[PDB]
Design an enzyme around this catalytic site. Structure first.
Site, short mmCIF file in Angstrom:
data_model
loop_
_atom_site.label_atom_id
_atom_site.label_comp_id
_atom_site.label_asym_id
_atom_site.label_seq_id
_atom_site.Cartn_x
_atom_site.Cartn_y
_atom_site.Cartn_z
N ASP A 16 49.35 22.99 55.39
CA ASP A 16 48.34 21.49 55.47
C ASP A 16 48.27 20.97 56.67
OD1 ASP A 16 50.63 20.03 55.40
OD2 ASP A 16 50.93 19.78 53.42
N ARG A 30 45.84 16.68 59.54
CA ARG A 30 47.13 16.59 58.29
C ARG A 30 46.15 16.82 58.12
NH1 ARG A 30 49.05 17.29 53.41
NH2 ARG A 30 51.18 16.31 53.39
N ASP A 35 49.71 18.04 49.18
CA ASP A 35 50.59 18.81 49.72
C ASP A 35 51.29 19.66 49.86
OD1 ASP A 35 52.92 18.10 50.96
OD2 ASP A 35 54.61 17.80 49.35
N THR A 36 51.49 20.52 50.89
CA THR A 36 51.72 22.18 50.60
C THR A 36 53.72 22.51 50.46
OG1 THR A 36 51.75 22.31 52.48
CG2 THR A 36 49.99 23.56 51.33
N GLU A 38 56.93 23.02 52.00
CA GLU A 38 57.17 23.37 53.45
C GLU A 38 57.17 25.14 53.33
OE1 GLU A 38 56.93 20.89 56.17
OE2 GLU A 38 56.76 19.62 54.94
N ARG A 76 48.81 12.44 64.02
CA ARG A 76 48.29 14.23 63.61
C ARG A 76 46.67 13.19 62.92
NH1 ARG A 76 52.28 16.81 58.83
NH2 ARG A 76 51.98 14.21 58.56
#
Ligand code: THP
Ligand code: CA
Length: 130
Positions: A16, A30, A35-36, A38, A76
């Site tokens: 992401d 970002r 949300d991917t 980690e 970001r």
């Protein structure tokens, strides 16, 4: 309406985040509203490889900011990223490699488009939803 702006790929990072040159400056972006996992977590390797392939195979990259804040507290960029006209944020959700997440008021223009995608990935029991 939001608008797409030009960028060029610097490098893929993970599910992401992606490094793009935007208005001639290198930036980490970002992806809004997702949300991917980690890289160390389940489906994190798959999510990273998805976003990597999607951005590396495209010839045109675009940034679309929403109505609210354009950078987060880590510096970001916060945007929807498009690769050959296809939104990476939405693609990730649709394949079950990200959850809709981090939905903050005033930066949520594509919330329902992504939730629709998540419902279909969940129906299909894809990846995160398997
Ligand atoms: C996606 C997104 C993340 N963030 C912040 C919230 C989280 O704070 P914390 O670092 O305090 O958890 C962090 C999550 O991003 P990552 O999922 O990349 O870690 O980024 C925003 O502030 N705005 C956003 O739109
Ligand atoms: Ca993440």
């Amino acid at each position: 309406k939001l608008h797409k702006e030009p960028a060029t790929l610097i490098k893929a990072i993970d599910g992401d985040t992606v490094k793009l040159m935007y208005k001639g400056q290198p930036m980490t972006f970002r992806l809004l509203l997702v949300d991917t996992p980690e890289f160390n977590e389940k489906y994190g390797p798959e999510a990273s490889a998805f976003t990597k392939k999607m951005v590396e195979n495209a010839k045109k990259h675009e940034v679309e900011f929403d109505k609210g804040q354009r950078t987060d507290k880590y510096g970001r960029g916060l945007a929807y990223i498009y690769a050959d006209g296809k939104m990476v944020n939405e693609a990730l959700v649709r394949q079950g490699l990200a959850k809709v997440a981090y939905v903050y008021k005033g930066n949520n223009t594509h919330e329902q488009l992504l939730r629709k995608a998540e419902a279909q990935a969940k129906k299909e029991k894809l990846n995160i939803w398997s």
